[PDB]
Structure 1
């Protein structure tokens, strides 16, 4: 996670789509959903990113509705956005023990207990935090079993990006969890 504001330039696809759902949080605009194989995923937008501006207009105070409208009326060719990198999230680096364990329990993507004398304890992983990413891969909406799977088939070094559950629950509010499973970009990025 960067402490950084970056510029991205987006191009609407054949269908007029960019692959993004946005949400009003604390008078800012945040990425709720990035669609697989979209302009939004290709330029590298992520769940939890803050949209500071669209085409040089400040997003401060916008409704979710107005952000979606502004995008719909954009002139196709080139949409500029100013992005602050996942500001509600932190990344924790942990190392599996020889039993392949980092040292926590989670339910519905939420960390619920840290196991004594584990890598997760030593690194101060918190409970009541949703798992957003594992090793740079979005896992939001994946079954718990697929999250376990991704942690199994990772190397011994495990990076997990987390979000306080209260913030997470505010962002995905009014997104049916099957769009989350189905349409949230879970791909490793392209180069």
Structure 2
């Protein structure tokens, strides 16, 4: 089900959040670390239903950001649906220490034949969100590879359509 969240604006007068209009709906594109957004448990992928009571259905990215910018008081209220496009998939590394997919800009671009990823039916055109609980949104590809490399045999990732 959805849920309500109350959060306050920081010194610089922001919440550390980017919103994207996708199919006439507003979605969290990035949540900056240690921000008011972070504390109340907002994460990349969350759907924004209302902002201060008003429905977001139909709003552009620009409209959604302009509402928050001129939003009145200390406290903004938001009705959220938790990552509705969330898919978790558990994979196992082979002898070479690989689960078997290629990615660019944190998005899966190809699957390796007869790998663990192929076995479990991983899909391309999906962004990597987490790896074993560690959020990888807004990291460089090399930083993602480090996390993959420093993982154990069991590799659980969370994905979403691009």
Shorter-chain TM-score: what band?
0.7 to 0.9
Greater CA drift, 110-119 or 41-50:
110-119
Question: Are 1:7 and 1:81, in contact at CA under 8 Å, matched by a contact in 2?
Answer: yes
Whole-angstrom CA distance in 1 between matches of 2:68 and 2:153: 42
Question: Are 2:30 and 2:138, in contact at CA under 8 Å, matched by a contact in 1?
Answer: no
Q: Which has the higher helix share?
A: 1
- How many residue pairs get aligned? The number is 159
Structure 1 spans left out of the alignment, 5+ residues: 1-5, 164-190
TM-score by structure 2 length?
Answer: 0.84
TM-score by structure 1 length?
Answer: 0.73
- 1:113 shift after superposition: 2.6
3-state DSSP of counterpart to 1:161:
strand
Whole-angstrom CA distance in 1 between matches of 2:19 and 2:140: 23
Q: Which position in structure 1 is the counterpart of 2:146?
A: 149
3-state DSSP of counterpart to 2:66:
helix
- 1:92 shift after superposition: 1.4
Structure 2 spans left out of the alignment, 5+ residues: none
Question: Are 1:29 and 1:51, in contact at CA under 8 Å, matched by a contact in 2?
Answer: yes
Whole-angstrom CA distance in 2 between matches of 1:26 and 1:137: 28
Whole-angstrom CA distance in 2 between matches of 1:135 and 1:146: 15
Question: Are 2:30 and 2:137, in contact at CA under 8 Å, matched by a contact in 1?
Answer: no
3-state DSSP of counterpart to 1:145:
helix
Whole-angstrom CA distance in 1 between matches of 2:90 and 2:120: 7
- The correspondence of residues 129-168 of structure 1 with structure 2, limited to 5 A, is 129-163=126-160
Q: Which has the higher strand share?
A: 2
- 1:98 shift after superposition: 4.0
Greater CA drift, 133-142 or 11-20:
133-142
Shift of the 71–107 alpha-carbon distance from structure 1 to 2, 3 Å rule, reads: closer
Shift of the 65–144 alpha-carbon distance from structure 1 to 2, 3 Å rule, reads: closer
Over the aligned positions, Cα root-mean-square deviation in angstroms equals 3.0
